[PDB]
């Protein structure tokens, strides 16, 4: 079970890293350039925790057949607490500065829209498929790695 929880935490940290990159890159594609700087600061906080645990930033290669490469280092919980206290204020600031801007909404709303049938017929998964209203996530439909305990 500890292997399941460790792998879930690492995957969620990297999911937050990827989502911060995606949101900042979308905002930069709209035309606002400062949230990518701040989101990369938050990515540096995540990278601090991931560097502490796995010894690498981007390609940790830390999972193993039957577990993970090492035990968690002493003091990982302090870095996780620091990131968990740092994140939500920054996310709210990102929303208020860029995601609620009407210029961004005019650039984004109604652009390249598809429904459930088009998403299903093209194999679309993830946020697009769930944005069509179909509630299909692998972590709930076909649970793996102890995700049912969360």
């Amino acid at each position: 079970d500890r292997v399941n929880v460790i792998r879930v935490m690492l995957s969620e940290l990297f999911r937050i890293n990827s989502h911060l990159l995606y949101i900042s890159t979308f905002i930069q594609d709209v035309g606002a350039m400062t949230p990518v700087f701040f989101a990369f600061t938050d990515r540096q906080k995540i990278y601090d925790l991931v560097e502490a645990i796995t010894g690498f930033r981007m390609h940790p290669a830390w999972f193993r057949i039957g577990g993970v490469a090492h035990d968690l280092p002493r003091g990982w919980d302090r870095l996780l607490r620091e990131f968990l206290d740092w994140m939500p204020k920054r996310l709210a600031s990102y929303e208020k500065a860029a995601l609620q801007n009407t210029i961004l909404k005019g650039r984004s709303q109604g652009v390249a829209a598809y429904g459930a049938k088009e998403a299903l017929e093209w194999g679309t998964t993830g946020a697009g498929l769930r944005a069509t209203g179909i509630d299909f996530d692998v972590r709930k439909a076909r649970p793996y790695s102890g995700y049912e305990n969360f």
């Binding site: 990159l21 990518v36 700087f37 701040f38 990369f40 600061t41 990515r43 540096q44 502490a52 010894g55 930033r57 981007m58 390609h59 090492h70 035990d71 280092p73 002493r74 003091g75 990982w76 302090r78 870095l79």
Partner: protein, 198 residues
């Protein structure tokens, strides 16, 4: 020591001409404009170096150009796929003199872990490279270190001052390898922190 291109020669370098060539080299090394070119994950760490937590703008090397004509430095940061190799060659040819090349990451250095049918084994198969960065990916501060190494290489080189007056040969300093320079301090390391703590 120097390498000639138009041959291993000596230092060619009047006292006003030397000072003004030094000012040319200082201006070139303190004003480096990298080219915006996304190949793979190494480019993500390169643009991480561009961001606020690292601020490579402090060195004057943040001006990212979408046009190769206005870019002085090409950072090959990613794998040299066989379909992308003519594109990289054309983009390098579109740049203007003086042009410098930094290979970032094991893929650009040698092919890295992709000794595979669809990958060119290193960008130096077809494009000259001045600074290599090992890593997969190199961290953003390693990119900054390679930038400083490029500035030291630029500040010690001799280029034609004008296309109508003087020698038109390009002189590149054969600097000491960083491995032999840092062998004094690296071998003397005795104890490192244990991996159990943070």
């Amino acid at each position: 020591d120097y390498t000639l291109t138009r041959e291993i020669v000596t230092d060619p370098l009047n006292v006003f001409m030397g000072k003004l060539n030094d000012m040319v080299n200082w201006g070139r090394k303190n004003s480096i404009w990298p080219y915006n070119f996304g190949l793979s994950c190494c480019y993500v760490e390169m643009v991480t170096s561009f961001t606020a937590v690292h601020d490579v703008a402090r060195f004057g090397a943040e001006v990212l150009r979408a046009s190769p004509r206005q870019a002085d430095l090409m950072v090959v940061a990613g794998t040299c796929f066989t379909k992308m190799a003519p594109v990289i060659q054309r983009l390098y040819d579109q740049m203007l003199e003086p042009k410098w090349v930094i290979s970032m990451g094991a893929c650009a250095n040698s092919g890295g872990m992709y000794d595979i049918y669809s990958v060119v084994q290193g960008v130096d198969k077809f494009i000259p490279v001045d600074v290599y960065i090992p890593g997969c990916p190199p961290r953003p501060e390693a990119y900054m270190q390679a930038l400083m190494l490029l500035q030291e290489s630029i500040g010690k080189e001799r280029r034609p001052l004008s296309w109508v007056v003087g020698d038109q040969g390009v002189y590149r300093a054969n600097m000491q390898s960083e491995r032999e320079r840092k062998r004094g301090e690296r071998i003397a390391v005795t104890n490192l922190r244990t991996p159990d703590e943070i």
